[PDB]
Design a protein around this ligand. Sequence first.
Ligand SMILES: Nc1ncnc2c1ncn2[C@@H]1O[C@H](COP(=O)(O)OP(=O)(O)O)[C@@H](O)[C@H]1O
Ligand SMILES: Nc1ncnc2c1ncn2[C@@H]1O[C@H](COP(=O)(O)OP(=O)(O)O)[C@@H](O)[C@H]1O
Ligand SMILES: Nc1ncnc2c1ncn2[C@@H]1O[C@H](COP(=O)(O)OP(=O)(O)O)[C@@H](O)[C@H]1O
Ligand SMILES: [Mg+2]
Ligand SMILES: [Mg+2]
Ligand SMILES: [Mg+2]
Lengths: 371, 371, 371, 7, 7, 7
Amino acid sequence: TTALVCDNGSGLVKAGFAGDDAPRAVFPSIVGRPRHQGVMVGMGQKDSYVGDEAQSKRGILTLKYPIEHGIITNWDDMEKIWHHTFYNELRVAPEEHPTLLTEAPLNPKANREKMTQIMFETFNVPAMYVAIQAVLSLYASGRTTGIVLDSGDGVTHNVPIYEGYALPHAIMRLDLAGRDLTDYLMKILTERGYSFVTTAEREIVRDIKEKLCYVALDFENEMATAASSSSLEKSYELPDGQVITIGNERFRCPETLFQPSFIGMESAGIHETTYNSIMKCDIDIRKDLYANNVMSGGTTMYPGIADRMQKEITALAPSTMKIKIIAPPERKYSVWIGGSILASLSTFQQMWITKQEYDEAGPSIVHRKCF
Amino acid sequence: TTALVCDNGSGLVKAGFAGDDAPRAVFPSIVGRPRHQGVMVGMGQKDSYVGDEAQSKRGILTLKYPIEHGIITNWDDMEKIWHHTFYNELRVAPEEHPTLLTEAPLNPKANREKMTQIMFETFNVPAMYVAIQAVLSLYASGRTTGIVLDSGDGVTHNVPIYEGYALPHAIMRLDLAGRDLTDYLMKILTERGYSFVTTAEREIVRDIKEKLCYVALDFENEMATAASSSSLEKSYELPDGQVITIGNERFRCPETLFQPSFIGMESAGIHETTYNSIMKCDIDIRKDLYANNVMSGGTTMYPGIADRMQKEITALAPSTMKIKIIAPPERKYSVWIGGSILASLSTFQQMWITKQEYDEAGPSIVHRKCF
Amino acid sequence: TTALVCDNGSGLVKAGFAGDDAPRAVFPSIVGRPRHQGVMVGMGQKDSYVGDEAQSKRGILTLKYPIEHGIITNWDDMEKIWHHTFYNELRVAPEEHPTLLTEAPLNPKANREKMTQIMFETFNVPAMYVAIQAVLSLYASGRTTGIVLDSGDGVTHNVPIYEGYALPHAIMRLDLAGRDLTDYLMKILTERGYSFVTTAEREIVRDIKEKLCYVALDFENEMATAASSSSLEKSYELPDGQVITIGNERFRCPETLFQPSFIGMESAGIHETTYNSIMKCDIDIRKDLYANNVMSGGTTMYPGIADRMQKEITALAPSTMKIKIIAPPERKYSVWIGGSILASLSTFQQMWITKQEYDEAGPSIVHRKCF
Amino acid sequence: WXAXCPA
Amino acid sequence: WXAXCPA
Amino acid sequence: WXAXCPA
Ligand SMILES: Nc1ncnc2c1ncn2[C@@H]1O[C@H](COP(=O)(O)OP(=O)(O)O)[C@@H](O)[C@H]1O
Ligand SMILES: Nc1ncnc2c1ncn2[C@@H]1O[C@H](COP(=O)(O)OP(=O)(O)O)[C@@H](O)[C@H]1O
Ligand SMILES: Nc1ncnc2c1ncn2[C@@H]1O[C@H](COP(=O)(O)OP(=O)(O)O)[C@@H](O)[C@H]1O
Ligand SMILES: [Mg+2]
Ligand SMILES: [Mg+2]
Ligand SMILES: [Mg+2]
């Protein structure tokens, strides 16, 4: 009938039918299994809770993300997540609707081949497609030229596109993302003292980072202000009931993006990677890419990240080139919106991967879909 | 005059002057207060007994450890302990000798700052330094490269160091240590019947674990052998004359280190944390980290812990790499030996935190000497 | 006393006294600086490691090549390599021996002038000469007529010479070299999955390319054979102990030389550039240049490169003209051997740049070394 | 500790 | 991943 | 380089 887009992120699965303006169901990409004893008190139980159900009762589970750093490592968990989505969230038969998936650039061919085989054999989708997340974000933005910085939960890539001609040699991929920032917040929350070690406590730390953390325009000045007994101290109430105070940790957790050396990463910050990706293009493309810096991804929702990135790039970029950063309010679902736009296009209907093509070419057929 | 090293552990305080090969005085970090009535029979009494005196007459006291899992909970108790050490054990005036202290990694800055303020105000040490236990253990081992696991009474941390360049991002901290093993032994001694609830009974259980407990090379095989009516049954005599028999509890109490799920802890075993910490370093670094596994701390003295850890790591590590574990016979005082070595160095004499620096920078001055 | 030849390449510094048949000391042109924290176990260290020492302990260093594409970028680092070579490798005073340098053609004059000034003022070299690498390679080959393809780590130039009369209008310089091939191997090893990001991991990728990579005689046929489950799959062992498998990536890493469009470079392959350089000379010279094709540089050591480029040139060149390629086994040190031959010539002793000439003409005197 | 664990 | 990084 | 390419 109608195609459905399932953007399976590395920490948040967003799925829904093509043509909609927002995902129909958004739940964490978490598969949890009971950790404690089975216990005498049992009236109906499940050996594994998937999605929002796992996080609802996360006090008795060891949540395990099937995807991190943009790669599925537990394929049984991914099969469980896909089945849960298709049969509980969208509540539709996958054998009737084509499915469009998103994959981060610079990813193994084995992973995409395995996902294709799983969705074509376990499920019976008549057609399927795998697209790069940054291209979908650019589709959602509505423009044809620009450089997309999609910073998800597990990956942070950067694909520059000019007039619809993507340059597959200036794509820079970084492994700094929401999970690494959450781990860093867990590590540096030790300084004040409030430390969280378990996976449920890791989810609590992730919620703390989502609610309180922000990006400082000037790191040194903000650190001095915080150390000077300023008002940068917000209070968060844990589920147990005890309030905690966050001081300079608010702007130090997301400062890892612009300073990967905090967790001992040799790579450069997101601003430096974006500048290098722009500088790797042709000299006639740099001017347009400078003024069309499209931002997407969940972790690009920090307050003040756009201003800090613009200031850093303007410092790096020549003074005579205008720098503009586009940060739409729908950055969290930009990839899914672009996927929905692409899947409903009249021209895209001929670029699917039909079941006959998969049968005649085997699982190793998704290699002409490179963007 | 001469520097003194006071390694205040979470259950065993070791103190002594720098340059010595062994601590001058080792006493439990226990502060006990009378529990029963004062009673008409009083000719000479104290309201609180510290260290060995508290354990000598523990039958009428409620022993309370001031330090546990590394953090000082009661500060008056540690003021008492430090005064008792300095004025009864070393029998020297603290105002003349610099004091070098040891703190577990990934600890709150408030604890170290308060310890600094206490030692610089209540006492008058001309200088004082705070170091990390694993770094001191590596100093004692005599090498410059290797990964240290210091499993003390309250904490079990892990600091990998290569060529004297420790990585403060691969440090894994665990809360499984001698106190948790003692509590688990108290819980599982109930199975045979012997129960121990009071603090003195907790000390008795600690002594039982010290004398009889051991780490099995294979847990399932050892459990089957014990259940098959074997000779794994030793007899311990309680202070009141009764004798008890320990069966499979000998290798079940220290198996919690390799299986934290026994007491409902989600974290992985010490072998898995050590493997992760070795691996989290650079790819060129683990070649020397695999072959330089250094252990320290009291709880690393179980018979067969080295063989079990080597087998587990070799199972986890690639088969083409040699795995060597270094377990010196002085593992109990390895941290103190390393501290004595460091404090007597000619290069270290400029790294002290002088009283003038503390006065000019306040009590929040120990953040430039992080290890 | 005697002249010394220091061929400072863009990734491999080769130095030695004139008259020898091989460089006395060959070490990577790498300056490494510490990256991790401020050292815990510290007694005697250095703030920067140069050459083989940097690569020995590269796990804690951020290696930075001072010379990129044959152009010196970090002058302090280049001074560090020069001093390290002169005072540790040859172990001679630079103020006593004349020094002969090598510089790629079509290079900025500022680079050569600054190199001359640095080595003539910081050191006290009595006489310094700068020569083109291809001319030195032709000197090493022993002939006077031929076309030299010196494909080093940073540059790939092509200087045609006839009867000792170099043609400085058919010289074609390409920026595709060993560094770009290493980067492409880093990018395309992601397909199977094994990805390397850090500079030490970049050195690992360079070692992989040196050991396993080869040039296919026919690219399409070799690709089809590799995709047909053939034996073109070698195994490499990483320093951590894991074995990796390289399939079609073996002949795809060095196929960029013949197809620069792989990394989005408009320039043609090395064979096409060589043919164009030959066709830019006089019609009476092409016959001799076709039969005297000379290879040099490290990256010309791939197995089967000579046959591949001979086939490509024979396809491009007329069928009636004999095509011969000279590939001596000493291609790695051909430039240094030619420099040693030239510096020991009796006629060349008058072509030096003495101290008096530099003093009377400042540092803009190296412009009549034009070749 | 203050949050998480006792100490 | 298989070599380099975990995944 | 200064213009074109990095070096
Ligand atoms: N308002 C917010 N502020 C800060 N971080 C956020 C916010 N919303 C989401 N995130 C982070 O973004 C990550 C995932 O976002 P998203 O990109 O939508 O999912 P995915 O990464 O699966 O594509 C989460 O791990 C979360 O930490
Ligand atoms: N021989 C031994 N066998 C088993 N456990 C031991 C042994 N010696 C000490 N321990 C345990 O180690 C713990 C503390 O030892 P130690 O590391 O010396 O003190 P701290 O933890 O304060 O540094 C004690 O609680 C004790 O239970
Ligand atoms: N046996 C080999 N096989 C493949 N590549 C090689 C080999 N030896 C050297 N190389 C490559 O040649 C490059 C530089 O070699 P060389 O020409 O000796 O140094 P330079 O470029 O400084 O003159 C290195 O980056 C290396 O990758
Ligand atoms: Mg995403
Ligand atoms: Mg200790
Ligand atoms: Mg060269």
